[PDB]
Amino acid sequence: PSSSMADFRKFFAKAKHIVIISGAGVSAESGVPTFRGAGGYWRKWQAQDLATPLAFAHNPSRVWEFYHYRREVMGSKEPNAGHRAIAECETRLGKQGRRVVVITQNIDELHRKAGTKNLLEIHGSLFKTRCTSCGVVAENYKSPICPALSGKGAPEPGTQDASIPVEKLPRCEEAGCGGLLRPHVVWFGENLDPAILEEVDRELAHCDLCLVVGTSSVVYPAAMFAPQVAARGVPVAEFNTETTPATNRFRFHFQGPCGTTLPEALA
């Protein structure tokens, strides 16, 4: 896979429909905890322990404490130069009649905070709820999401469960519902929204350039998307921190923090 920025820029200059697949590394460069992989814990758990239907079924208070903490942490986090290069790209190309779409597994909305409008959040958002009774999905930026969670979700080991009764967890505010809300986030063992997948497929079918940023093209989620693109002969450029180009079959690989490489690549 080629390391030539100048060669990439030649493709970039001509591209009318860029797909940008954004993985966990873009959020990690902003200091966002992911609670996955080595060392990444909340209390004694990782996401695989808490982001599951069974965990929510058995201990919804503990799961809401976890998501409350992650919501509140975002008050001290900012998009990085990679988010900004991506948003600025969308804005500049959009005035030229050229499309940029960001397909992200990140749930922290830093792409939105950076100014990205064309965003497919395949794992949902920390700042959306879904009613487990009526199914309504709502934006929710309230700090705290409900009064009982104020000061809860502390991440330190040894912190006891808040054990909030379900009636005092976040409830649906649709007239005549009152159901228990969950985060509008894909959990382990759960299906992706098929409508989002349909939209993803449309973008991949039409794009003439694909970036994979902050993740590898041979693991989920990029492995679900990049092969479709490469099969049509569309260049795929990878921007990640692996010194190993874990792939060939993809045209480009640029090693380093996305905040270092993308401002140059997308200028």
């Binding site: 695989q48 322990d49 599951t52 069974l54 965990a55 794992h123 894909v186 382990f188 063992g189 759960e190 989920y220 989620p221």
Partner: peptide, 4 residues
């Protein structure tokens, strides 16, 4: 518990 691991599977997305």
């Amino acid at each position: 518990h691991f599977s997305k």
